[PDB]
Amino acid sequence: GPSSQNVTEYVVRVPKNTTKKYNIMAFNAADKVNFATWNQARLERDLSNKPEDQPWLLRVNGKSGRKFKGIKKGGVTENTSYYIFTQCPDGAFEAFPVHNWYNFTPLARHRTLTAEEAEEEWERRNKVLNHFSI
Amino acid sequence: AERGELDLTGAKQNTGVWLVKVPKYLSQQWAKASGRGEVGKLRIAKTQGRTEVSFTLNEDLANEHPFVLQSVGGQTLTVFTESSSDKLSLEGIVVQRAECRPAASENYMRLKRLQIEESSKPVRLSQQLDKVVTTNYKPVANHQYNIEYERKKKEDGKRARADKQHVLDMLFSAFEKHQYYNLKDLVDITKQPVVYLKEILKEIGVQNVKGIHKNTWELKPE
Amino acid sequence: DGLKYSLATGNWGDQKKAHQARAGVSQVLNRLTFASTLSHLRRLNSPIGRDGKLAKPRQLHNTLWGMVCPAETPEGHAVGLVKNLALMAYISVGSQPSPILEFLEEWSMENLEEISPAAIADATKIFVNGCWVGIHKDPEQLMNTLRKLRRQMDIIVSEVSMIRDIREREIRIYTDAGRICRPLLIVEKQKLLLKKRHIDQLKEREYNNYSWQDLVASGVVEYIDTLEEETVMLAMTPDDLQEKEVAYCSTYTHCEIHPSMILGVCASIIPFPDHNQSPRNTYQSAMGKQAMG
Amino acid sequence: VGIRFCQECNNMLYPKEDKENRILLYACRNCDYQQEADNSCIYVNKITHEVDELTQIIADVSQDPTLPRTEDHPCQKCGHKEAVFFQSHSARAEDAMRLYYVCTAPHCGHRWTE
Amino acid sequence: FIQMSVQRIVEDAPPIDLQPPRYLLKFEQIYLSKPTHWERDGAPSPMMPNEARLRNLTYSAPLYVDITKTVIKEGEEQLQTQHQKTFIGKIPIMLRSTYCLLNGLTDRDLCELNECPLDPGGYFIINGSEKVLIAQEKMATNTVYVFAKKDSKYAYTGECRSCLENSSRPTSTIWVSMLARGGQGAKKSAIGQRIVATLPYIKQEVPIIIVFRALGFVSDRDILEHIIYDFEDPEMMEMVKPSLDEAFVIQEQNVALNFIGSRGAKPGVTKEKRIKYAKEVLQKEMLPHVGVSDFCETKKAYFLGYMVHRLLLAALGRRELDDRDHYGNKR
Ligand SMILES: [Zn+2]
Ligand SMILES: [Zn+2]
């Protein structure tokens, strides 16, 4: 087979400089997101925190077509750097440093804030259960 | 064209990228990348029952690393970027993850020696002194005291007591800015002593606390 | 005048706030006789209030096999709440557990962050100093390697204790301080790692400088703390059990140096202690804290 | 005895039903994904709780240095004649001095009770 | 204490900031010099111990730190003047220690100084009187222990002494009790046998699922696998389920923080403030050894789930309850 006899040899390069700081996007595979359905996307730092530390806000297919929140990982180069390896037309490999790791989680559709009154309603339901006796 | 606008080209191209974990000491070797940034040559050998990917350092960078392939399942990983021109771009989706380990050689012998060299700065230590260091010197005028003296002299305390009508016109300009004025702010405005300033302020109007303290001074209604 | 105040008055804490400060510590050394001086210097104090109605702590628990001298107990309101160490115990001084973590990195440890929550159930979870530090799939190997390491004085000091329990699959490696430790000999199959040549090197210590460090660094002695003592099988004497018959057991890992080193610095001045009643021997250690000389 | 988690909203599902077909259903209260209850059976409480330890014993107990090695009963599954015999080491201690034994032969683990 | 812990205590301490211009003080490496007593004239001099006992004199070695002072006065000019070896105080010294004066002197010498070679040492001559510090036993820390209280409604209760490693003295005791078949059943809502967790710096006991959600991991499935690792056991699902439905909609992490904030201190001032302290208290006060860093509370979650799981093991009888007298559970 071609892949069963795929012996090759290339040349690796980590350019000391890059005109595009490479990071990591991280959606879920249990979600099996069809990237083809992404006609467009918007990507902005999250506004709850009101920059480089800011969590990302991803808006795909419009403001409410698809939306995710990305949360930064604790560390990325604390012991070992992460590199992006890319194939070039000359066959040689090019390596790119990973600047950061962001975790993108599918956002709940309802969102909003339930508030203290909703918590109080749960407490009232608990009180009704407490009231029952003999 | 907007700042919060994300390019989806990479994704929509289904662009693939590779993800490799690299030790810091190697990564430190890589910050010294040879030439433009070339760090060496990769060696990929695939067989029917096995596949081997290896990296060898550039002769220059040097002055066999087998790869361990890792699963990327459980998390769809992609690579977004921020240009020097701050433009944003998605280069691709991660199709492979891997880790560079030693060739079944480095245990805790060569490692411990690299670690001994790695320690470099041990957390500091309590050293043993010989005899006793001098503690009390013989200064005549404390340095802090000498500095205030030059300032205390420069502006001899406060001032004298004269031209109250001329001062009143300046106070009236301050009163226009705020109907009630803090006494301390007025003290900064006038070089004359606080006691003399207070007498002029009492003449212009009775002090009013205003419930905020500071005895704010306001013009008399009369 | 904070350390002097506390080290003289014996009150542990700030001089002003005496609300949370215990006392009954930093007492004057007893110098009446040399034996009393040694006993006073080597003493623990279980810190429970004396009059909790129950007497659970005072009863000797079985886990004091050489950790504390059983005979030496004071009589009075302090009964069994002041114990003295056995002659060979050695409390740990304290180390940093960072080197050992780096070893398991090249020994197939998976940091918890990387591990999927799913795989945790099947394998065993190394815990270090009480902080979960990962999971390793085949436990025995890490252990068999770990002991080899402590035994040759490389990454881990003899003081680290590697305890591993089969039923719950947690290998906890504790490297903190204040852990009572007993040096015990190590035996492979049914053979003594200690061998004749070594005793010969120790006999001429004056010229060959073969110190106890050398005996340990040769891996013929190991410090087995109480947590390690939970998993191990010890033989009272090599002649008694490291020989074959219908053995009570054949898996003995460690055999004790001499059983009469489970008694402290003032019950070792007593000959034939087993022949005498045990209360009489306790009363005599108390009388020794009285004899002049 | 089992759980159902909302496939999408991800929440434990609850035994609900509709009078329309008098049919058992399991529904999350977080949102509306609901499915008819397939088991048709709900809460169960067992007081007797007679549980065989053969299930619980892990097979790794064979290597414990301390546990005994009798040669009396050879492995039924493999015939190595050595084994480790232990008592319950659990509660439900009203009637339990049984001797669950385990195959010690490396890589077997037959858990033969007796 | 001399060789290592003292350097660590001074080296690692809050930086001194005091500001217009501000003033910065940084401590460096502690030096400790052999014991010395300066007489009325003041020639500082050595104090062989025999004299200390006879002249009712405390044995103390001068401790000297080095402090560097850098000042920014809005002139954007830095002047880190360095003061070296500045007296901070004197520490008592054990006799026959690496840092005493009798260390390693051959017998002829100790005899010349009128000291006894056979004498053990290991005492502090404070106020001219030898003081021995009796080693005081302590309950062990860092281990989930399950101890069962006979009288209380809590059928079992698990605790973790919390210690953070040569850093800070305060130690916390998170408790993760279960309310199963204990004392009087009373009400406690429809739910029964609920896992409940007291925590550091709170007011009323907090339901466990909430704390987990508040740390995060809102997905009820995530909480479950963090505690019960294998879903195969039939008995396990029934045991973890009553408490699973404590209630919900506490799912927003912030909402959860608020519920715990309302479950804390006193009549809550404001949700924003309540969220702020509760948020920071969990990061430092709870499980400090597992998660000293505020970031990556992932480690804290695994340990919190572990205490809940170990309490379940005691309930189903898989692992026997722990002992309070074993000498391994004592430091
Ligand atoms: Zn739902
Ligand atoms: Zn078998």
From TrEMBL, chain E:
Domain RNA polymerase Rpb2: 140-331
Subcellular location field: Nucleus
Domain RNA polymerase beta subunit protrusion: residue ranges: 1-331
Protein family membership: Belongs to the RNA polymerase beta chain family.
Function: RNA-dependent RNA polymerase that catalyzes the extension of a non-coding RNA (ncRNA) at the 3'-end using the four ribonucleoside triphosphates as substrates. An internal ncRNA sequence near the 3'-end serves as a template in a single-round Pol II-mediated RNA polymerization reaction. May decrease the stability of ncRNAs that repress Pol II-mediated gene transcription.
Name used for this protein in its record: DNA-directed RNA polymerase subunit beta
Residues of the full protein shown: 127 to 469 of 1251
